[PDB]
Amino acid sequence: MYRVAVIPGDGIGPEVIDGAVRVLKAVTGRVRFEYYEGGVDVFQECGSPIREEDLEEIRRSDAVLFGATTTPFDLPGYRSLILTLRKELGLYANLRIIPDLRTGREIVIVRENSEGLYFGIGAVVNGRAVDVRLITREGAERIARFAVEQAKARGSFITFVHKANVLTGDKFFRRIVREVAGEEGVEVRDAIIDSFTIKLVRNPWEHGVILSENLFGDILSDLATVHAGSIGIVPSGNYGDGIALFEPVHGSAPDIAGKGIANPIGAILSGAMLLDYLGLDGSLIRAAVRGYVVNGELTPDMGGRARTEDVVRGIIGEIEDLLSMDE
Amino acid sequence: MYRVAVIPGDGIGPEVIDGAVRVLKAVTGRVRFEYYEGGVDVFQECGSPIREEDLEEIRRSDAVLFGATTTPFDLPGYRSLILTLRKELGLYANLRIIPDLRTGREIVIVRENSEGLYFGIGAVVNGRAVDVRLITREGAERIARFAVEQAKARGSFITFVHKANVLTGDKFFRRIVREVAGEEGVEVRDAIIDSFTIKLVRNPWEHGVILSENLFGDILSDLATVHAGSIGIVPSGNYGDGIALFEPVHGSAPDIAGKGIANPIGAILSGAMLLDYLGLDGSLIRAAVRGYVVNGELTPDMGGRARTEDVVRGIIGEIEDLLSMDE
Numbered sequence A, B: 001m002y003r004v005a006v007i008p009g010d011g012i013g014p015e016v017i018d019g020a021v022r023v024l025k026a027v028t029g030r031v032r033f034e035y036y037e038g039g040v041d042v043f044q045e046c047g048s049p050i051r052e053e054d055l056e057e058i059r060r061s062d063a064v065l066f067g068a069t070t071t072p073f074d075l076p077g078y079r080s081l082i083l084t085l086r087k088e089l090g091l092y093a094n095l096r097i098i099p100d101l102r103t104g105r106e107i108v109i110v111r112e113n114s115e116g117l118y119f120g121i122g123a124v125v126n127g128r129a130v131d132v133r134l135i136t137r138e139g140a141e142r143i144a145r146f147a148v149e150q151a152k153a154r155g156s157f158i159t160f161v162h163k164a165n166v167l168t169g170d171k172f173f174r175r176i177v178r179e180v181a182g183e184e185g186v187e188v189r190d191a192i193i194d195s196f197t198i199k200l201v202r203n204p205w206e207h208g209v210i211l212s213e214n215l216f217g218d219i220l221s222d223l224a225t226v227h228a229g230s231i232g233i234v235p236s237g238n239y240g241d242g243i244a245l246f247e248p249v250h251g252s253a254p255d256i257a258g259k260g261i262a263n264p265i266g267a268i269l270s271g272a273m274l275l276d277y278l279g280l281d282g283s284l285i286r287a288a289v290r291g292y293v294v295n296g297e298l299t300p301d302m303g304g305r306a307r308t309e310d311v312v313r314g315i316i317g318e319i320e321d322l323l324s325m326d327e
């Protein structure tokens, strides 16, 4: 069996993960699920958002499925669970796919996930606060390679988004992205981070594989979300050399926690990207979701009246029906 | 007389500045205009995008009116004219006002303009590229004060946009913004840079005085632009303690240069913000623009068939008619 660590988190985390696990169970019986706590509770109790011993099982698992975690601003010494797991497990590539769920058109974003303004060199001293945006040859290269494989796989091009005009690290990063895309015969279109925000809302579907630095990607990927109607249908993968973690792009949504209305599609489609990572199909889940939305009542964030459970059952329904054409 | 340095720049720069100067001349005869070259030509010839001796007249003028400048990516040692003038003239506050020109609703952005990722400490060394995001007590304070005056003046609040969760400099900056807004009894709403991109496209009009770091503001202010239909209607002021510079938010647009179709409204309304800065009215220009757009054919970037000249004349028309109610 494939062993998959599951980390529901908190807020709506549990609800949408329950959704995504049940859908996985409905397409494959080849995966064992092991549940771990994580978040402020774990921190309050142990000093870390994840326990050391759990982190050691987690890192030896085949893949991780992650819900969402509340990172409270006013809790000293506390670091985000997802940011922590990203660095601990070596997850340098973040891939976010925003779908127009009717047409099947996609915005594809590759966010560098290990460095940039997330590298973590910051300090205050004598009324001077500083954060170091670090781009590194190995970091630029590996994420460039990752982005070219996504380009190749789609017969498409790379839109590298930057502020190389102002940021010496983006000048460096651009160079490297262009070399590897050269080595591999992939086209690289320039885009500048400020004007690209306009192109992204007005002409979403024409940019191929978007690649950018960590924080830039964080920003762009939330913006791209407007073209899917809700952030809560968007999935992601966080990939490293020996493992990967899958989570919906959305967050804790603590205000609607436990009310039965959260959108599970983000988690579910993240479950799909997980099956792909293991070499199971995922296509079935994607087809099932697409199949369901043609006439299914959706969640309130999408404008519908449906409960979380109606969507979950609805999609499982499509999956059971889909099973019988391995053919 | 008021002495105003005018820097047309290049690309569509000249065209829209010609527009904005003529409109100014039509509302006040109390301003002398002095023209200076700037951009790559000046660089190629002298090593600097602005000549030292001109920069010395410019800095002793009462205000600056600036068109737009082409900053070519592949020109070694060349720094942006506008970025250069921002630092040389001490222009730490950038104010961008995006208008819905029918309703009169506004998005108000205060971008810190002297530091952050624009401070200019960057380096590469042994495959390691770095840029230092610097926030400084004096920089945080002065821009916070500037933002509270814009809040007070509007009987409104401040939306401080950040990534304090990840960026130690934004934690520092937040603190300072909250203290001064406290001293002054102004409300400060938190917003996070990634999710705020969603709020900004979906609920543009409800955020009061948006304040952020330099690069964040650069990014947000281009995005806000989608709610005005074209970037080319949006004006800005760059303010420092002894002087200010006014420029449309848009850029060179070299591809449509010299074709007669550029939108001058951005420059014109920037001319308005200039009159306000001198203590002339500006209201007249704003009223004239609003007056003109109710039935005037607009430029191609707004979907119309009008030439640059039709809009310029049209607005002057409204101004001449407006003059006779000092009353």
Ligand SMILES: [Mn+2]
Binding pocket: A218, A219, A222, B194, B195
């Ligand atoms: Mn984010």
Ligand SMILES: [Mn+2]
Binding pocket: A194, A195, B218, B219, B222
């Ligand atoms: Mn910009």
